[PDB]
């Protein structure tokens, strides 16, 4: 399948070169997989989700996304126009308030929630969790991310936006999950992206168009935007049978475009997520 005039990040992850605008992907499109977006919520009524998104948990007075961030991330995973995996099932877990903030104890609870809740959902092709959030190092937060991964969920986490070594942020620094840095449309590391040996992969993160609350769209930047590209890619590859939750981060790194990014500090991987789709 081909989607013309796609957002640049979708085109980039199906391409060996920058500068194109068509997204190529297998029609299966993540059908039968599930992606949890652990964030500010998801505006499930947005036409772009087509009934495939549901809020399943909140830790606040409402499950509504009053911010937009979680809706944007969910859109990059799985909206019809702006998403990688256009037929996946999206589940929202609201661990961040409408200001985009959350206590670590609530974030931990949300991760352990997903490890259990996947047993309440039909996801025959596999389960992914996308965590576009983080803060300073916490062993308890890292341990929760490790548990979620251990339980059979592909965990993708944002590296962070301090232009610093990600070893000092959580859950970015947990080795067993898939830590995602951000790139721009000219294959430069995004200027804010964290780096370091704990990164596993880069994805598009500067000027990413996706869904927003109020039935709208907008373009924003962050490692928060790169992470759902990798989460959606994992769901897509799991539906195709190419990998599993335990193996997907390694598979994505093995099949990535190599050596194509600029301003990669020495010691950080030079790997850009790629779907290897050949029509
Ligand atoms: Ca890993």
From Swiss-Prot:
Q: Any idea which positions bind Ca(2+) 1?
A: 175, 177, 200
> What cofactor requirement does the entry state?
Ca(2+)
Q: What class of enzyme is it?
A: hydrolase
* Entry EC number(s): 3.4.21.64
Say if the entry is tagged with keyword Metal-binding.
Answer: yes
Q: Name one GO molecular function term.
A: serine-type endopeptidase activity
Q: Which reaction does it catalyse?
A: Hydrolysis of keratin, and of other proteins with subtilisin-like specificity. Hydrolyzes peptide amides
Q: Which residues form the Peptidase S8 domain?
A: 7-279
Q: What does this protein do?
A: Hydrolyzes keratin at aromatic and hydrophobic residues.
Q: What family does the database annotate?
A: Belongs to the peptidase S8 family.
Mind telling me what this protein is named?
Proteinase K
């Amino acid at each position: 399948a081909a989607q013309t005039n796609a957002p640049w990040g979708l085109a980039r992850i199906s391409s060996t070169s920058p500068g194109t605008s068509t997204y190529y992907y297998d029609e299966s499109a993540g059908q039968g997989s599930c992606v949890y977006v652990i964030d500010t919520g998801i505006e499930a009524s947005h036409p772009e989700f087509e009934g495939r998104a549901q809020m399943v948990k909140t830790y606040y007075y409402s499950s509504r996304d009053g911010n937009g961030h979680g809706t944007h991330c969910a859109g990059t995973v799985g909206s019809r126009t702006y998403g990688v995996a256009k037929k996946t099932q999206l589940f929202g877990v609201k661990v961040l308030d409408d200001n985009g903030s959350g206590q670590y104890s609530t974030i931990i609870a949300g991760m352990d929630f997903v490890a259990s809740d996947k047993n309440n959902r039909n996801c025959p092709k596999g389960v992914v969790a996308s965590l576009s959030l983080g803060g300073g190092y916490s062993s308890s937060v890292n341990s929760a991310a490790a548990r979620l991964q251990s339980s059979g969920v592909m965990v993708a986490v944002a590296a962070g936006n301090n232009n610093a070594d990600a070893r000092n942020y959580s859950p970015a620094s947990e080795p067993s999950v898939c830590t995602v840095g951000a790139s721009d449309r000219y294959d430069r590391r995004s200027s804010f992206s964290n780096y370091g040996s704990v990164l596993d992969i880069f994805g598009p993160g500067t000027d990413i168009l996706s869904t927003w609350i109020g039935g709208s769209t907008r373009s924003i930047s962050g490692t928060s935007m790169a992470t759902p590209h990798v989460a959606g890619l994992a769901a897509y590859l799991m539906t195709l049978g190419k990998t599993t939750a335990a193996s997907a981060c390694r598979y994505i790194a093995d099949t990535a475009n190599k050596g194509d990014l600029s301003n990669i500090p020495f010691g950080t991987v030079n790997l850009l997520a790629y779907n290897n789709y050949q029509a």
